[PDB]
């Protein structure tokens, strides 16, 4: 049910009176959360906030906020229904945002004086963005009749099965560039099943696997046909879920340790999403051997 | 040669004129470093600093400082020689100190109001103590004719060989209580050899192995004859040395995470020695599976 500063509705109605309360809530919350993001764009240093791409994303939000406010209060099913259509448009229009931001800010490196100030902007924007798209997709999900799912929430989610999905996805991206990809072994609580929201995992994991596999391959150019396995370990307790990802790609060099976590661009975002959801994302480099990555995600309650 | 706030002499003389400079330095430095420790005892909260055991250790230092100052300047070989005899007495008299402290402070738990204040006292005392005993033993070591050793410094130290020593030591302590002990496998840079000082390792390692083995055994009471291996990984680069110690003893429970690193009593001391020498000691608990421990030690220069 609950989430940081927001609620994901666990409710059921044969007549769909839950979709009213859900949408009624969404229409109260969404505009507020968007507005907070607009203050954040306004607070940007002039020099940066002026860069056209940043300025475009800035506009997108103003547009979204207009559209949401303009939409009239929901008093019946048909309202809610057409509301869903908006949320769909919005989700599609903002789908490339994180990319735009990245380039908006890449163009804008030189004029960057205070780093902490932007890293904060990004964290607050990218994560606050997540929460929005989660809350939105949860709602749309309430219309689906999918089994084992209350909204976007799995009732019986297997960490193993979902890691495997992202593995095949990552193996493929990888094989294509290097001709091979490291075998991936998974141990620990591989039979674990429990209520959870795939969405966060759906961003983060392919990030970590892409790295694990990239580093592994990049360090064995001589023997791409025989590379050390990527070892994933799952630990499920009553507090949170840990997923450790071990690679043997010589680890992140000492100098790069600072630079790697700061905003190639995928780890800092993953750390942010993790912290946002009451979890974390820690690194252990073993220079000369490999890297171990620890992702913790709080259990839902 | 160098060390934090102190120098370990790399020098050679057929006539032993190095033992003069060495001792001349020791006799300048030792009294200063002891005096700093006495200010630390004086700064203790009255209530604690009054506890007889703390008071005894307090006295020991005053005694040591007397003895060192009283000893007359070294102008010849025979001076230095009898100086060595003092340092030997001192090293023996202060050998049980860390234990005394621990009990001095255990008796004194109730009257503890500011924790950070004592944890700091301990870190500064135990580590500053290390440096003293290192500097002292280095000197005495300069008299030995041992090959591959300049003082207490190994010229060709194998992390593997030294871990193995502490493993056999830990296996034994362990087998005695549980009847078995986990096999220990070592990977990574197992052929690494390089200049180093065994001493720090000689404290720390048996600590970590004792834990790795304790946890492993304590979690497999049903099958002590078949327990998951302890996996040690060595990573040697040009900056520092990493030793990772992985166990499968279900890890440190969430609640205990805070308590475990604070002053059973062996980890906090190990973290302190590590930091002191420009290294660190990090933990990764995987609740339900095990713990991974990362020890970094700067390379000598
Ligand atoms: O996703 C973003 O970039 C910002 C959110 C846009 C949006 C709002 C409400 C519902 C759906 C989407
Ligand atoms: O070891 C301690 O507890 C404090 C050091 C005592 C000592 C001083 C000089 C040389 C040898 C020993």
Swiss-Prot record, chains A, B:
How its function is modulated: the record gives: The ATP-ase activity is up-regulated by potassium and rubidium ions but not by sodium ions. Up-regulated in the presence of apo- or lipoylated-DBT/E2b subunit of the BCKDH complex.
A GO CC term attached to the entry? oxoglutarate dehydrogenase complex
* Domain Histidine kinase stretches: 91-301
Q: Where in the cell is it found?
A: Mitochondrion matrix; Mitochondrion
Q: Which GO molecular function, any one, fits this protein according to its record? A: protein kinase activity
Q: Where is K(+) bound in this sequence?
A: 260, 262, 264
In the record, which positions carry N6-acetyllysine? 124, 165
Query: Hey, what's the signal peptide range on this chain?
Result: none
Catalysed reaction, written as an equation: L-seryl-[3-methyl-2-oxobutanoate dehydrogenase] + ATP = O-phospho-L-seryl-[3-methyl-2-oxobutanoate dehydrogenase] + ADP + H(+); L-seryl-[protein] + ATP = O-phospho-L-seryl-[protein] + ADP + H(+)
Give the binding site residues for Mg(2+): 211
A single GO BP: regulation of glucose metabolic process
Record flagged with keyword ATP-binding: yes
Question: What are the UniProt keywords, alphabetically?
Answer: Acetylation, ATP-binding, Kinase, Mitochondrion, Nucleotide-binding, Phosphoprotein, Transferase, Transit peptide
The entry's ATP-binding residues are 211, 247, 264, 267
Job description of the protein: Serine/threonine-protein kinase component of macronutrients metabolism. Forms a functional kinase and phosphatase pair with PPM1K, serving as a metabolic regulatory node that coordinates branched-chain amino acids (BCAAs) with glucose and lipid metabolism via two distinct phosphoprotein targets: mitochondrial BCKDHA subunit of the branched-chain alpha-ketoacid dehydrogenase (BCKDH) complex and cytosolic ACLY, a lipogenic enzyme of Krebs cycle.
**Subunit comment for this entry?**
Homodimer. Homotetramer. Dimerizes through interaction of two opposing nucleotide-binding domains. Interacts with E2 component of the branched-chain alpha-ketoacid dehydrogenase (BCKDH) complex. Competes with BCKDK for binding to the E2 component; this interaction is modulated by branched-chain alpha-keto acids. At steady state, BCKDH holoenzyme contains BCKDK and BCKDHA is phosphorylated. In response to high levels of branched-chain alpha-keto acids, the inhibitory BCKDK is replaced by activating PPM1K leading to BCKDHA dephosphorylation and BCAA degradation.
> Which family does the record claim for this protein?
Belongs to the PDK/BCKDK protein kinase family.
What is the protein's given name?
Branched-chain alpha-ketoacid dehydrogenase kinase
Parent-protein start and end of this portion: 69 to 404 of 412
